Design a protein around this nucleic acid. Sequence first.
DNA 1: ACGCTAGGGATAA
DNA 2: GTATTACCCTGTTAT
DNA 3: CAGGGTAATAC
DNA 4: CCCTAGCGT
Length: 224
Amino acid sequence: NIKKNQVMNLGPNSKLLKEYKSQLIELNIEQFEAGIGLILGDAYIRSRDEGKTYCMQFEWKNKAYMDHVCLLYDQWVLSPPHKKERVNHLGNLVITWGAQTFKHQAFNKLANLFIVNNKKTIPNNLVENYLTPMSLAYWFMDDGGKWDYNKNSTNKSIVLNTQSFTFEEVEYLVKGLRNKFQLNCYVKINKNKPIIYIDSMSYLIFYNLIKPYLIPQMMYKLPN
DNA sequence: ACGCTAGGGATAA
DNA sequence: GTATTACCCTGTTAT
DNA sequence: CAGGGTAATAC
DNA sequence: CCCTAGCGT
Ligand SMILES: [Mn+2]
Ligand SMILES: [Mn+2]
Ligand SMILES: [Mn+2]
Ligand SMILES: [Mn+2]
């Protein structure tokens, strides 16, 4: 039998590796529900071969979140993360962390929910049928945020920065959240692209939904 | 003075 | 030589 | 967030 | 995602 131990160094196309993968069949219901959220948020899910198999690319600033995600995809990630030191068009140094799963036929069940055009997409009823509270957490940790950023703000209102999507797509996400969790929310706008504003009248309900799953280094994102 | 938005910047995707 | 593919790399901007 | 490129096995 | 200049109490 094969352990990640003995494959995590071998060349990409190596037979031992490819046999490693053939043991894994699907994604445990944690890795799956988290990925609905990670993909709504900050994760790249890509297919270099026409959808026969997808992988997941990661990039974040927060080495703790990065480390935590990797520990959740323990089986699917082979290497600890590659610190990326980049220089932007203003001579400024930016420090991110990067990583990736290997491709596997198991990541399609995720992919086919979003990727159509070869472009990330939201289908109707996605939230009803798959989004769960654990999903909602990683969505928040990735793209979520304050409405009111002035300190001394007693405001408890939350925004989910969905500017990647079409207004029609984001509208469907909203109907879902509204029906399925009973959150008082609704779409606003920012740079002419949609965001989901959750009214503070439900930061009770939204918080108790995502507090079970929220990692510590990501607590600086909430209100107070 | 001080709570609130919407406009907009420099990353953190 | 072709096929393959995880790790990196940069392009680029909506977050 | 999204694509490109290559070095490392396998044939 | 986050900050902040400006209107409105
Ligand atoms: Mn996003
Ligand atoms: Mn994020
Ligand atoms: Mn994001
Ligand atoms: Mn983006």
